[PDB]
């Protein structure tokens, strides 16, 4: 498939920090297509959820400023601001925001994905479509990555990487 | 057009349900973001 990277420039669209449902219009109504995190004026989600499409609050436009297909990450309103890194052997929580469900934290001890590069945490939890972009947090309440890009095992199990970059 | 609606705060909850499994797998990530288990 194609790859791309975007890296950009801040605008002249204010949101409270926290975890958001990303919804899309009808007819029939709105449907959750994914999840994102607002931290320090920047909205962070996964590339495949929005594909760079304009977000809207109230209100007015919120436009992409940084994106990476390989990473499967995108940020609206500024560059990436989630700088926390997962440590090998530390347990994490996923704040899973599934369609039509209350948010719920799930604690897990990730395994590891070995690449030629290095190591990425592996989260063997299986949430419904629409919940990609849910944040993965550490003990300090800091986001170490986003959930929703992964692999299927030889046993049929779904296993997400911890999608993270390096902030700023 | 896409909309955004607040759901929760970024907070660790103390008595969280524990779940999942710790796999150790070799993968490649290609440029389009696809992860594949090394076969």
């Amino acid at each position: 498939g194609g790859s791309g990277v975007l890296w950009d420039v801040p605008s002249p669209a204010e949101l409270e920090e926290g975890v958001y449902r990303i919804k899309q219009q009808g007819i029939f109504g709105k449907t959750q297509v994914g999840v994102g995190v607002q931290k320090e004026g920047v909205f962070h989600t996964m590339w495949h959820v929005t594909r760079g499409a304009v977000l809207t609050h109230n209100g007015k436009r919120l436009e992409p400023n940084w994106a990476s297909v390989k990473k499967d990450l995108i940020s609206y309103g500024g560059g990436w601001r989630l700088s926390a890194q997962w440590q090998k052997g530390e347990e994490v929580q996923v704040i899973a925001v599934e369609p039509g469900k209350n948010p719920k934290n799930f604690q897990t001890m990730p395994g590891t994905f070995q690449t030629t590069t290095g190591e990425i945490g592996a989260i063997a939890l299986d949430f419904k479509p629409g919940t990609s972009g849910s944040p993965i947090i550490n003990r300090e309440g800091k986001v170490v990555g986003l959930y929703g890009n992964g692999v299927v095992t030889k046993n049929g199990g779904y296993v997400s990487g911890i999608a993270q970059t390096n902030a700023e | 057009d896409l909309t955004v609606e607040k759901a929760a705060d970024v907070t660790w909850e103390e008595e969280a349900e524990q779940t999942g499994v710790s796999h150790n797998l070799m993968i490649t990530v290609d440029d389009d973001g696809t992860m594949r288990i090394k076969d």
Binding site: H48, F127, K128, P129, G130, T131, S132, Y147, G148, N149, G150, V151, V152, Y158, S160 | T34, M35
Partner: peptide
Amino acid sequence: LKRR
């Protein structure tokens, strides 16, 4: 499959 691979994505949520």
